Write a protein that binds this ligand. Structure first.
Ligand SMILES: OC[C@H]1O[C@H](O[C@H]2[C@H](O)[C@@H](O)[C@@H](O[C@H]3[C@H](O)[C@@H](O)[C@@H](O[C@H]4[C@H](O)[C@@H](O)[C@@H](O[C@H]5[C@H](O)[C@@H](O)[C@@H](O[C@H]6[C@H](O)[C@@H](O)[C@@H](O[C@H]7[C@H](O)[C@@H](O)[C@@H](O)O[C@@H]7CO)O[C@@H]6CO)O[C@@H]5CO)O[C@@H]4CO)O[C@@H]3CO)O[C@@H]2CO)[C@H](O)[C@@H](O)[C@@H]1O
Ligand SMILES: OC[C@H]1O[C@H](O[C@H]2[C@H](O)[C@@H](O)[C@@H](O[C@H]3[C@H](O)[C@@H](O)[C@@H](O[C@H]4[C@H](O)[C@@H](O)[C@@H](O)O[C@@H]4CO)O[C@@H]3CO)O[C@@H]2CO)[C@H](O)[C@@H](O)[C@@H]1O
Ligand SMILES: OC[C@H]1O[C@H](O[C@H]2[C@H](O)[C@@H](O)[C@@H](O[C@H]3[C@H](O)[C@@H](O)[C@@H](O[C@H]4[C@H](O)[C@@H](O)[C@@H](O)O[C@@H]4CO)O[C@@H]3CO)O[C@@H]2CO)[C@H](O)[C@@H](O)[C@@H]1O
Ligand SMILES: OC[C@H]1O[C@H](O[C@H]2[C@H](O)[C@@H](O)[C@@H](O[C@H]3[C@H](O)[C@@H](O)[C@@H](O[C@H]4[C@H](O)[C@@H](O)[C@@H](O)O[C@@H]4CO)O[C@@H]3CO)O[C@@H]2CO)[C@H](O)[C@@H](O)[C@@H]1O
Ligand SMILES: OC[C@H]1O[C@H](O[C@H]2[C@H](O)[C@@H](O)[C@@H](O[C@H]3[C@H](O)[C@@H](O)[C@@H](O)O[C@@H]3CO)O[C@@H]2CO)[C@H](O)[C@@H](O)[C@@H]1O
Ligand SMILES: OC[C@H]1O[C@H](O[C@H]2[C@H](O)[C@@H](O)[C@@H](O[C@H]3[C@H](O)[C@@H](O)[C@@H](O)O[C@@H]3CO)O[C@@H]2CO)[C@H](O)[C@@H](O)[C@@H]1O
Ligand SMILES: [Mg+2]
Ligand SMILES: [Mg+2]
Ligand SMILES: [Mg+2]
Length: 755
């Protein structure tokens, strides 16, 4: 480029910056092409072009001006890249602001979509504010290749589509530009099928939706509604290995954490809306907005000391009672809680408070509702046509045709959409088995094998591996968590090693062993010591997340306190012992709302949590227990740096089944960060109980779950204990401890203590 062209950009004299900024073809070679990417980045000192799908990164050079950059790259196609932009000591990674010079679909967009590889398809499909032929308006586009006709119906034309019939392109996608309408427009697509039957559809790529049970899509100017402040969080994420950090997740269903009064409006970020009543049966209550949740949930979480909030599905879903697991509006956060920008504010405020956001994401199925994706164009479009692989009959839902390019593209781009537009830090996928097996919940003679004779759902396995490959390339440092309950191997291992590419898997076996164990009367736990120790045998085959989830405190399973045997003191003590053990056992942590304060009743998705219990001491004390435990977990490197390496854990002894006692070491990089953990899983205290330790010195009591401030009886070792030169558990030193009842001790050698 010339200096004159540069200066025209710098001084805002150029007639159209898209002619020189962004990605431009310089020449075609025999097997490759030569491209240039240019950027004007005021205040940046340096920039790079990242091609994350090819695993490449190229520096950009300043050209004529220190903030004007060019980068010349040879590659057959340059569809997928990001700009890394350094301003002083800070780096951000963004998409190229000059990537798309028109709102309409190009030939290239249609080709990439037809092949399933348009990672940014949601920039063109759906509804977008823009300018065509010199006039501002909205461009709509929808994939419906077998429809006979499609029109746009909405508020602007009183729901009559005759003067807004769309144009079909390349036998696949319908489009229309509508002048002089903008964000806030309410609409649907009116589709006529090959039979001549006419029906109404919500926008599959819609960005906002009326409040259930109304289903019209609403236009959002999604890049001009919210100003983020989380660059430093995102930079630290991208540069960190979350597997080596503390990950303590508070799992939350937004509709049922806390309700407000329906006698007032729902406040929004600088505005308000009518209340959304929780149900016809509880008409005095309304949901809290994303804005109100940012003001209340976030400081509550921060004060408890969790690192992450995990949300039950917030994608738009028509029925409260699915808990969000039956989604129909994949590209929009549910309007129950307000607007897209209110959810953006929630996430930005999490990041300001040093809290990450994980979204439950639901790629496995979708319900039959007529506004949604089902039979979209008068054919089986999103779902597979054969019910043996296209329906989950026990659930009444439809299964995406993962092999169909544009379907795969809908879902792959959807995952990326949440990280791009809403800055989230991770996803969790429920019931992964439901996608992986062609015989899932199907009887003999009601399913068919894959092409090689097996039960593996090949197309699903390939989709999952693609999701995870792309997610980690585009957004390094995120969490991708699976629950897979069969024995599928390598779930949380890299795709290059034959894995599915998640980085964490819920340890459902551990969960069952623990909750079954603790439900046993303590005298009988001696016959089930193996529940305590078993999960450590297979532990190193995956990266495990230890989750005690929402699913465990419904349908007659009781809440945590009610699972435990004995009187009220023992029930609390069991909950403290279990969770202290969970937090010291190797693996990341997840627990569900209500568990941190000892709610007695089961989670009820139709009300909110029993917050009035926090007026009473035993609940307050358990909440303080969790507050202090989370603080300890973040303060002790041996609880999180080496979760997934042999070095991080070793049993000291687990042979004392008749007293239900176990003990072990946790380790980190520094040997002085080593911890000794001792567990007593009956209410019988022990007074001179020997435990082997590897070195001399004073072992400080960092934590004792029987402390009186946690509701315990206040037995313990009075702050710490000197080890004896008395060999035990095959170690050269030993501690002579008092083991409090139904309690866990965490001890740490202080090598500077004065004898
Ligand atoms: O995570 C929450 C929280 O946990 C820790 O803090 C807890 C403790 O774990 C818990 O034990 C307790 O400690 C408090 C304590 O209640 C306060 O009274 C005070 O303790 C004083 C003590 O009162 C003084 O007398 C003095 O004790 C001497 C002791 O007099 C002397 O006899 C000897 O004791 C040895 C004893 O003779 C042996 O028999 C044996 O005693 C055992 C028994 O065998 C057993 O059956 C049972 O009863 O328990 C006894 C205790 O183990 O061993 C004894 C040696 O340990 O030597 C001691 C040494 O002084 O001194 C202490 C120190 O001031 O303060 C402690 C410490 O705060 O409550 C706290 C809070 O709930 C954790 O330390 C804290 O950071 C965490 O927040
Ligand atoms: O103009 C009349 C023509 O239209 C008719 O063909 C249609 C089909 O009915 C549509 O359903 C569609 O077919 C696409 C399909 O939508 C798309 O996903 C892709 O199919 C891939 C698939 O993703 C992949 O998994 C694998 O199985 O291979 C498939 C084949 O490539 O492409 C399909 C074929 O284009 O669109 C066409 C055109 O609208 C009619 O049947 C034609 O005979 C007729 O010419
Ligand atoms: O010096 C006092 C005693 O210290 C030790 O007693 C221990 C018990 O061994 C532990 O099991 C525990 O006791 C719990 C008990 O397990 C639990 O059932 C509950 O019992 C209460 C009950 O809440 C209450 O309503 C009423 O009925 O009285 C019962 C009192 O026992 O709560 C107890 C704790 O409060 O902890 C105690 C105290 O550390 C030691 O073993 C005893 O020999 C000694 O007497
Ligand atoms: O007054 C009662 C006694 O109290 C003290 O003994 C304690 C020990 O200090 C504790 O460690 C524990 O003992 C366990 C032991 O930790 C555990 O390994 C298991 O021992 C098995 C052993 O693993 C196996 O290899 C073989 O040698 O048999 C051992 C004996 O079974 O089980 C032990 C308990 O049964 O608890 C005891 C108290 O019961 C103090 O040290 C004693 O001297 C004192 O008398
Ligand atoms: O103020 C009058 C009226 O406004 C609201 O109704 C809107 C719907 O919520 C919205 O879905 C849309 O309804 C259209 C359907 O979506 C569409 O499928 C088709 O069947 O036509 C409908 C309009 O006829 O528009 C209406 C009207 O704006 C509010 O929710 C109503 O209850 C209220 O009475
Ligand atoms: O070093 C090998 C192995 O040692 C440790 O494993 C112990 C388990 O942690 C524990 O449950 C127990 O295993 C038995 C099962 O509980 C029982 O149900 C059945 O399958 O037999 C098992 C075989 O013994 O004891 C084992 C062996 O000590 C440690 O936890 C592992 O990580 C480690 O690899
Ligand atoms: Mg399940
Ligand atoms: Mg068993
Ligand atoms: Mg309530």
């Amino acid at each position: 480029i010339s200096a004159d062209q540069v200066n025209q950009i710098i001084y805002n004299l150029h007639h159209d910056p898209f002619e020189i900024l962004g990605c431009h073809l310089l020449e075609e070679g025999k097997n490759t092409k030569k491209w240039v990417v240019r950027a004007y980045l005021p205040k940046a000192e340096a920039a790079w072009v990242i091609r994350p799908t090819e695993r490449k990164e190229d520096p950009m050079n300043s050209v004529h001006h220190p903030n004007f950059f060019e980068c010349i790259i040879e590659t057959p196609e340059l569809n997928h890249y990001q700009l890394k932009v350094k301003e002083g000591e800070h780096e951000k990674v963004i998409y190229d602001p000059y990537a798309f010079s028109s709102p309409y679909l190009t030939d290239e967009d249609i080709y990439l979509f037809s092949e399933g590889n348009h990672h940014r398809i949601y920039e063109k499909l759906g509804a977008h504010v823009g300018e065509i032929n010199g006039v501002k308006g909205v461009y709509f586009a929808v994939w419906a290749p077998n429809a006979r006709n499609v029109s746009v119906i909405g508020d602007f034309n009183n729901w009559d589509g005759r003067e807004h019939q769309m144009r079909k392109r390349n036998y696949t996608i319908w489009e229309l530009f509508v002048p002089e309408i903008g964000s806030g427009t309410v609409y649907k697509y009116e589709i006529k099928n090959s039979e001549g039957h006419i029906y109404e559809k919500s926008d599959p790529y819609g960005f906002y939706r009326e409040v259930r049970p109304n289903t019209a899509s609403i236009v959002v100017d999604i890049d001009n509604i919210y100003q983020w402040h989380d660059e430093e969080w995102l930079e630290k994420r991208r540069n960190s290995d979350p597997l080596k950090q503390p990950v303590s997740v508070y799992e939350v269903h937004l509709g049922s954490w806390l309700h407000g009064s329906s006698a007032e409006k729902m406040p929004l970020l600088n505005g308000e809306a009518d209340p959304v009543i929780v149900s016809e049966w509880n008409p005095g209550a309304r949901f809290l907005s994303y804005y109100e949740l940012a003001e209340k949930l976030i400081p509550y979480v921060k004060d408890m000391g969790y690192t992450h909030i995990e949300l039950l599905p917030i994608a738009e879903h028509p029925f409260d009672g699915s808990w969000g697991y039956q989604v129909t509006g994949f590209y929009s956060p549910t309007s129950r809680f307000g607007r897209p920008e209110d959810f953006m504010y929630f996430v930005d405020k999490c990041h300001e408070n040093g809290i990450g956001v994980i979204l439950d994401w639901v790629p496995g199925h979708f319900p039959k509702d007529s506004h949604g994706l089902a039979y979209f164009d008068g054919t089986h479009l999103y779902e597979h046509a054969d019910p043996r692989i296209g329906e989950h009959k026990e659930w009444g839902t439809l299964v995406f045709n993962y092999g169909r390019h544009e379907v795969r593209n809908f879902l792959v781009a959807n995952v990326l959409f949440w990280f791009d537009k809403y800055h989230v830090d991770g996803i969790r996928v429920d019931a992964v088995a439901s996608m992986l097996y062609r015989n899932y919940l199907r009887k003999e003679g009601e399913w068919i094998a894959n092409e090689y004779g097996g039960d593996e759902h090949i197309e699903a396995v390939s989709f999952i591996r693609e999701v995870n490959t792309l997610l980690f390339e585009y957004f390094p440092g995120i969490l991708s968590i699976a629950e897979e309950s069969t024995e599928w191997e390598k779930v949380s291992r890299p795709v290059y090693d034959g894995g599915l590419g998640f980085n964490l898997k819920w340890d459902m076996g551990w969960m069952h062993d623990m909750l079954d164990y603790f439900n046993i009367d303590p005298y009988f736990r001696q016959y089930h010591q193996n529940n305590v120790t078993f999960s450590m045998l297979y532990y190193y085959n995956e990266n495990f997340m230890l989750a005690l989830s929402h699913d465990e405190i419904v349908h007659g399973k009781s809440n945590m306190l009610g699972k435990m045997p004995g009187d009220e003191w023992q029930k609390y003590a069991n909950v403290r012992a279990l969770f202290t053990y969970m937090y010291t056992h190797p693996g990341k942590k997840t627990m569900f709302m209500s568990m941190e304060f000892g709610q007695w009743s089961e989670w009820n998705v139709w009300g909110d949590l029993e917050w009035h219990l926090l007026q009473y001491e035993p609940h307050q004390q358990l909440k303080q227990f969790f507050t202090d435990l989370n603080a300890l977990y973040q303060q002790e490197p041996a609880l999180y740096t080496h979760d997934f390496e042999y070095h991080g854990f070793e049993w000291i002894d687990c042979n004392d089944n008749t007293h239900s006692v176990v003990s072990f070491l946790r380790r980190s990089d520094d040997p002085n960060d080593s911890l000794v953990v001792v567990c007593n899983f009956t209410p019988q205290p022990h007074s001179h109980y020997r435990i082997g330790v590897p070195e001399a010195g004073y072992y400080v009591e960092l934590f004792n779950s029987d402390a009186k401030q946690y509701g315990g009886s206040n037995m313990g070792n009075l702050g710490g204990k000197w080890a004896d030169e008395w060999s035990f558990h095959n170690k050269p030193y030993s501690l002579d401890l008092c083991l409090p009842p139904l309690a866990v001790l965490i001890l740490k050698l202080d090598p500077t203590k004065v004898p």
